[PDB]
């Protein structure tokens, strides 16, 4: 049930927690963070305002795509928030 | 060295106090804009327009 949200991303910036701080959301790499992550409006609302996009804990820093995912334009899909059903 | 550091502090404190002594010799009702509470002290165009509206609502019903 690890599925990405894949909704139209807005102006909200994705956040990472203390455990996931250096990670890439899509491929889980740690090398060369390149592009700032954007999330949709339903992922950024109320109690969901600041939360890790990978796990859902309290965010502390910005989420980034890696250079490898940026080269393949994998930052052009929807909201990359991990959502469980 | 520690004794010298302690001395330097003592002298600075003494100089400040002397300067101060030298100077000294030379020399509510509560209200809020968030309330309408006034302090102590104490045909029509609204009905006509209301009558025009009431007429519209009655006609629709």
């Amino acid at each position: 049930d690890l599925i990405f949200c894949r909704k139209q991303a807005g102006v909200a910036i994705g956040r990472l927690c203390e455990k996931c701080d250096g990670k890439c959301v899509i491929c889980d790499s740690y090398v060369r963070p390149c592009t700032l992550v954007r999330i949709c409006d339903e992922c950024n609302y109320g109690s969901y305002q600041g939360r890790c996009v990978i796990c859902g804990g309290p965010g502390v820093s910005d989420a980034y795509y890696c250079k490898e995912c940026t080269i393949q334009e994998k930052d052009r899909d929807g909201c990359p928030k991990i959502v469980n059903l | 060295d520690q004794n010298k550091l302690e001395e330097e502090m003592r002298k600075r404190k003494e100089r400040v106090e002397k300067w101060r002594e030298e100077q000294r010799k030379k020399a509510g009702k509560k209200w809020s804009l968030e309330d309408d509470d006034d302090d102590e002290d104490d045909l029509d165009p609204l009905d006509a327009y209301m009558e025009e509206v009431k007429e519209e609502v009655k006609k629709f019903n």
Binding site: D21, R32, G46, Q72 | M9, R12, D35, L46
Partner: protein
Amino acid sequence: EEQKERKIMKLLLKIKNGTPPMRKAALRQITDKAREFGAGPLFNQILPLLMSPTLEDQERHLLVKVIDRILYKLDDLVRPYVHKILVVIEPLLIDEDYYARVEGREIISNLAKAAGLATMISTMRPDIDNMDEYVRNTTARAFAVVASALGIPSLLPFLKAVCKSKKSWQARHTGIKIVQQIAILMGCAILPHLRSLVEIIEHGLVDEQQKVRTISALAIAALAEAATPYGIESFDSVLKPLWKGIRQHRGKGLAAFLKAIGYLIPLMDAEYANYYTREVMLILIREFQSPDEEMKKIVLKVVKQCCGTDGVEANYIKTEILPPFFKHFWQHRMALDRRNYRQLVDTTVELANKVGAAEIISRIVDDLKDEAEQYRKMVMETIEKIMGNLGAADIDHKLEEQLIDGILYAFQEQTTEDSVMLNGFGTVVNALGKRVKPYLPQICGTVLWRLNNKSAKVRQQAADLISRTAVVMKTCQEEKLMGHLGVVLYEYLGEEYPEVLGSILGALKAIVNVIGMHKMTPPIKDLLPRLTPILKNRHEKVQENCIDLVGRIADRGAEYVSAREWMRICFELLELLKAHKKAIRRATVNTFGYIAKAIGPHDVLATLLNNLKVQERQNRVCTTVAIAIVAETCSPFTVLPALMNEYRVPELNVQNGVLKSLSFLFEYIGEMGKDYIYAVTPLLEDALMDRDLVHRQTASAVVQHMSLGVYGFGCEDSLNHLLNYVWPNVFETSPHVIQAVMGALEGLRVAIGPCRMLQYCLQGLFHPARKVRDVYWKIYNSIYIGSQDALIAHYPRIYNDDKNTYIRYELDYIL
């Protein structure tokens, strides 16, 4: 049947405690169901559940969305219930929770759109004249929400009528409050209707009732704040009454009128701004002496607003405004007053930002020596803010002497360790720069006295000060009692408090990082063996600072300690690449790079290969990272032969480690790999011909990282050669192998181009077997989603049949 529809509209429980798929399913079905259910039962049940005392936030959000959707469909049937809904949701608009307010406003907006304007007005009009002040506020906020939903000109007639009511002053008050709430809620969207609203509310400034005048002034201030920096022609019929009122009024109404003046002044030109400032300024100077504190806050805000415009120049300010300001506001009574303290600091900083730093700084710097420490911290805060915003250029000899003496006396006279004095000292010294030569002996004596003893909470603050000021400490060409300080910091290396040890290590690092290893007193061959046992401490600040210090030492003083101890230190650092914290990992990477650059790649690489052979998973992964680091700092030419010689061992689990190391190496070096693709190609061939599955999976990962690493560098020959060996693995059922194969194919799509991939897919797209078709259409869809545009030039020609035309004729044109 009645409870029929109730039992079936328990759909809202289907949604409340339910799964997301059935959530949206029941949402859609209840949306289709709403018009037939009827608003009566639906609301009769939902408004209690929304009135539930312990509902959640997102449950409330989903309920609000349900309301939105069931309100859109049933449009004109909601009228007979509007009143009821309002009594439930006219609260939630003055709630201290922001999202509760957003949800209430959204609900009222959808309700106003569902119903009509006449219905909302007819249900909301009786509570316009109410005496309970709690109702007249929610009514005004709801009218503002309705105006924001249905538009301003649709409500303009009702407004124009209600604030001309001669029946009662409560109706006029509530109408003007509606205009004010409309401004507050809509912001800069009121600009096309500014003059209409202003002419609707302008006659209240001269009312016989004092509450109407106050609310009119507050509404004018709200409109002027929403309009900035545009709109002054629309505020023209208010300039005369407002100023006559500030000349005649006194008290609460005077405060409202002054707030209005202050919000209106920044909209004028230099002439009017300059002319109007003089008038309101004599009035404000008179009002400086007021006992009330709300009045003081308003006066400070107006002074800050007016002194920030162009029509007011520094001459008039220093001549008329500064003497009374500094005579009336700068007393410790202001310091214990926590309400207006920040306001005073901001007003003073923004005054200095126009009149010049020297005058403000002097007038308050004589006050740095004071019996009260609250008044000391206030002055220090203001001074360091001004210093950070403008600097110390026009500060002169007398002012410099006074500043230094004051900050020194304030540092020593300190009860509790505060960040205020620390930051003030730091920024003052940093702004003075190379100018403070003798106060450098003085400051060194002061920090020596503070660092000598007293509970290590003063010592850690002194260490922070050293860490932040050592740059200007040494750049002034002074190094000796710098070493005297370093000796004491060294002696303060055994500390039970990790917080103080972190600051000590930071100060030591800032010293050794700024003074040269040359001619410096505390020997490195003494500091480093004393330093290596601290690397095993478990505090984050201690660990980070220790790693940074060892890194600096290895970068500059590498020739002072044997290579064996460096090897031990790097083997110990190996375990810190697993840290849960990012700063620890960053510093560890840096320090490992420095140590590898220092002692040479050969021995560390031999040790790392031995360690990769014999350990558990996480340690082997960290060893792989370490090999990649060594190969990046010392060119991969020095690592690749020894790593490829290890693939020659005839034993599995050794070759797989070499392959994982090559994978991470290429991923880590990226563009640097363009010179090394020819060297690893036969090894990847061998690994791709192997029967072992991990061999082929890891070789595919290597191919992917190598492909994405070299892109635009002309390495297509080897990549096509390797694709010839990767492609036969598309008929693999193992999930990990096929995942790696797909990754490698999508990397080759970028490095090699989509034309080659389409050429590999063409003959299988229409194969008779369904397995081949499934695999090839998956690959083709992956190629098509990325670079759909390039494929236009690559499609093969397909001839027309009898029924259909397939040739693209435009591309056959020949100019």
